[PDB]
Symmetry: C3
Amino acid sequence: SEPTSSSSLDITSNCIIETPLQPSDFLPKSANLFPKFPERISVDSWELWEFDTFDTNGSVAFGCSLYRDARGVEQGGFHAEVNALWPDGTHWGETLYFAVSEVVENSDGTTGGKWLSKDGGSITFHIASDYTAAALDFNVPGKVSGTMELRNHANVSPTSNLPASDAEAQLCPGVYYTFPMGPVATSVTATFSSVGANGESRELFISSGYGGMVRGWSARPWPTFMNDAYYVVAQVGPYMLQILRTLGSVFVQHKPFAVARLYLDGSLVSAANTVVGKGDAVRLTKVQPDEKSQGLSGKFRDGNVGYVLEFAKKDSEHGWTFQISHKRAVWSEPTSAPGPDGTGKSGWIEAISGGAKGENYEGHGFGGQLQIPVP
Amino acid sequence: SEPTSSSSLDITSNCIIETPLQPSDFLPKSANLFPKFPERISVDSWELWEFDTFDTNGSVAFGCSLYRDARGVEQGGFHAEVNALWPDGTHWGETLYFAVSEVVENSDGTTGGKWLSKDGGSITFHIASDYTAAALDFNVPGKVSGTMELRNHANVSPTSNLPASDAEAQLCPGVYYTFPMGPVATSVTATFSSVGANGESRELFISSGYGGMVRGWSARPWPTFMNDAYYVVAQVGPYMLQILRTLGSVFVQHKPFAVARLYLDGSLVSAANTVVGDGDAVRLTKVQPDEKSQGLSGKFRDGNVGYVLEFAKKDSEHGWTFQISHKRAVWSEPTSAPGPDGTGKSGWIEAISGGAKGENYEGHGFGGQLQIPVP
Amino acid sequence: SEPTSSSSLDITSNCIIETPLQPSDFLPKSANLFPKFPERISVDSWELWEFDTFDTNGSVAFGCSLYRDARGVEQGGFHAEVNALWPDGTHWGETLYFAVSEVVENSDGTTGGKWLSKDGGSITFHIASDYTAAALDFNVPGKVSGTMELRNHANVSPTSNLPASDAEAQLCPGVYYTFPMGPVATSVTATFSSVGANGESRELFISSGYGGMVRGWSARPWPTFMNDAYYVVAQVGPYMLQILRTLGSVFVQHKPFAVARLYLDGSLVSAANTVVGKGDAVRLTKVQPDEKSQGLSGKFRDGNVGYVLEFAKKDSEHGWTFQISHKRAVWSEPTSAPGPDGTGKSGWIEAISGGAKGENYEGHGFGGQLQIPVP
C-alpha cells in the first residue's frame, strides 16, 4: 500500500518528445498495468486503461477510457472519455482533460491511477493485486461524480488466462491490447451535473451489471496500422465475449487484426489473436441494412447495421458465431469534415445472439466503432 | 572573428540518415539560428532560414527560403526557393539546389550561412549577434546575383521579444516556427539573367521596404501535421504582422495551429501561438468570391480570394482585425495531379487593411498558401 | 565452410521492434548479401533477396522473391513470392510464409540463406563468394520443389561493377536497390503439386535461360516513397538491362526515382541512379493503347500497354531507347478495394526491342508493375 513504482506525467510541463520512444518490455503473465512509457511520451505513443459497464438488459451504460497520449496537449490535459446512457435514450458524453496522470504500483501489488486537473477534479482507479477487482472514483466538478466497480468471480483466476507471450498480448507487432480481468460483474453509482436540458441526473448499475476492462499500449500511432475499428464486450447467455478488430490503413497494406476472447460459464474456451485468412482465429463481417432488418446505422459513411462475429477453433469445425445488431446509439462524433465520405465514431448498446452451431442465446453488449480518413 | 561552432553538410558524403533524429534542444531567448540537426539530417527533418522582402507599394517583391530538408536532398541538394515580382507583373521563380550547406556561429556571436554548389555558385547570409541585421549575397551563375538586407530599427531589441519557452516558439509539439528579427526595413539590389521571354532585369528595393525573416525546424515532416497552410508577412500602417497558420492533416486529428506576431511601430502588441477555438489567439477565416468581389483566387482547388485575420487579446473584447485580399499572383505550382480536386501552392502580393476598432490602415503583404493531397 | 556471420530470425521470438532501427552501413564494392538488420527487424524495415528466370523465347518464367519484411511478419512470417508461367498461359503463384529466416556468410565468402517453416519445408539459396553463381533449392510440401540456378559468365567480374558509393547503390536516400550478379544465364527444374484444375506440373528452363538477381533493403517503408513501381530484367540482342523505377507518393512530393543498369555483351555501358530531368539517367514513359496497338493492359486502373525506356548518357546525346510491350500476363492481384480507381499488381513476360540509333534488337523480359492506393 506504500508505492514501489511510480509514474507521474504532467502534459503541461514538457513530457512530450517528437521522435519515437520504445516502451518498457511486455511482462509475461502480468497485467502490465504500470505505464510502459513511464517518464515521457512521444507524439506517437499511447496507453489506455478502460473500464466499461452496462446493465443486463442494455437499458443503461457507463464507460470510462483513461488515456496517456499527446492528443490533448492543446486542451491542457490527458484524455478521459466518459459516456453514459439512460433507459430513456438520454446520452451524456465528454472528453475530459486532466493535466496530470499518475500511476503507481504499491508494495502489496495493487495498482493505483489518478487523472488530476489543476482545479482539483480527478478520476482515480484502484486494481487488486490479482486483478479480480477494480474500483473507480469520479470527482469532476460540474461534470460527473460517483463510483464504478468491476469484479471477477470466476473459478479460474485472472492470472491463469493472462498472455504468456507478446504474441498473445498483441493486436499486431508492437500494438498491445489485453483484457486482463476477463468476465466481470459491475456496479455504478454516479451523478451528472447537466444532462439533456441543463438538469442534474443520477445513474445506477447494481452488482449484477456486465462490462469489461481494457489495458492497451503502443509506440505506433493508430493511423499507421488502422483506419477502421470495432470494439465490443458482451454477455450472451453463458458466453462472455470481448474483441477489438481493426481494419488496416494502407501503411499495413489494409491487413485486418483482432484480439478476441470468449468465455463459457466463466472458463476461457477461445483466445484469438489472428483473423481467419497461435490459438484460435476470428472473422468479423459487417452487416448492411439490405441484408438484415433489425439494427441501427451510425451517422457517418459506414452504414453497417451490425456484424457477424465468428470464433473458429484451430483443430476442428466446432466454433461459435454471434449476430450483433446495433440496438441503441450511445456517442456519435465526426473524425473528418462533413460530407458523403465523412467518417466518425459511434458508440452502441448491441443486441447479440448466437453461440455454438445451432445455438440462439440472446444478450447485450457495449462497444463502438470508429473510422478515421487514413488511406 | 573565426567560427566557434560549425555545421557543414555535403550531399556526396552521408549527410542524411534513414531513421529519426531528435534535434538539439530549443534555446530560450535565442534566435536558435545554428542548425538543430548539425551533423546529419534525418529521414524527415527540415530546417528553414527565410528572408522575404517587398516594397511599400507592393509593386516589387523578392524572397529567399533556404532549406536543409530531406525532401530537397532526395530531389538534388540543399535547396533554396527564390521568387521575384516586378511592377509589370512578371514573375521569376526557381528552386535552386546546392551540394553543400554550411552554417557557422562565430566568436562575435554572428551567424553565417552558405549554400554552395560544385560550380562555385552560392547564396550566403550573415546575421548580427543581436539579430538586428541580416545580409544575403546571391551569386548563382546564369540565374541571379545581388544582395538583400533586413535591418531592425526598433527601440525594443529583438532579444526582448524572443520566445522564452517551447510554447512560444512552437506551432505544435516538436514543430518550431519563429520570427526572431521582428519588424525589419528591407532593401534589395539584384540582377536576374533571364526574365519573361528573354532578358536581363534588375530589381531594387530602397532600404524603406518591408518584409520579414523566418527561422523554423522540426523532426516531423509537414504532411504529418498539416495539409493546408497560409503564411504572410505584411505592413499595414504602423502595424507589422507575421503569421503561419496550418490546418491539420488526419495525422494530427485535423487540429489547426498558428504562430502569429503583431507589432505596432516596433513593439510587440500581440503574440499568438494558438488558434481561436469557438499569449493571445488568432482567427484566420478564408474569404470566398461569392462573399467579396475584390481579390484573385489561386489556380487549384482552393478558391478563396483572401482571408480575415483577427488577433484576439486575452481577456479583452477589443483586438485587431485585418482584411486580406489576394492582389497579385507571384508563384503557382501544382502539388498533385491536375483535376477537380487538384492541389497546389500559390504566392501572393496581398492587399491588407484594418487594425483596431476605428482604424482603417492600408498596406501590403508577401505570402503564400499551400495544400497537399493528404486527408 | 563454417559460418563466420549468422543472422537467424524466428517469428516466435522477438524478431520485430515497434520503433525505427538503423541498418548496418552500406559496404562499398560488396554485394551486401548479409542482412542489414541482422538482430531484428523494425516495424518499417524490409530486406529483399530476389531471383528471377525466364526462357529465351519468353514462353516460361519462374521467379522467387525472398523477404524479411515487417508487413510479411504482420501477415504470417518471413515471406516468399513464388510465380511460374507455362507455355500454355497457365500461371501458378503464391505468397509463402516461413517461421524462420536464416542468412549466414561462410569463411570462404559464400552466402547461404534459409527460409524455413514448422513442417520442415524450406527455400534455400547459396551464392558464390565472387557473386558469379547462385543456386536455390525449393522443398515446400504440397506447393513447389526443385532448383533454380543463376550464373554470370561475363569476362568483367561482378565485383568490378558493384556500387562504390551509397549513391550508386540507392534508389533514393535510405533505399538501397542493387543488381549484384549482373547478366546471368539461368536454369530451372521444378515440380508444382497443383496448377490450374488441381493438377501437378513440372517446369524446365535449360542452362540457356535469362533472368536476374535483386538485393535491396531499407528502413523506409514503400508507401512513404512510392505509389507506383515498374521493375524488369531483360535480354535484347546483346543487351542485358535491369531497372526499378518508382513514382513518388505524396510523402516524397511525388518525386520519381530509378535504379537501372545496361550491359552490352557482359560489360556495363550505362549505370543510372537518376531519372531524366554521378552516371547516366533513365526516362521511363508509359505507353497507352490509343498510342500503340500491340500489348496487354493490366486488370486495374493503370491501363498502360507498355513503356518506353531510354538510357541517356550525361556526356553525349545518343543513348539507347527500348520499346517494352506487355506480351503475357503472369500474376495479377488487387492492392485496394475494387472500383474505378482500384489498384493492383501485374506481372509480365515483356516483348522488348530497340537499342542505340540504327539498332533493332528484339528480346524478352520478366517483370511487373504495381500501384498502391497512397496519394
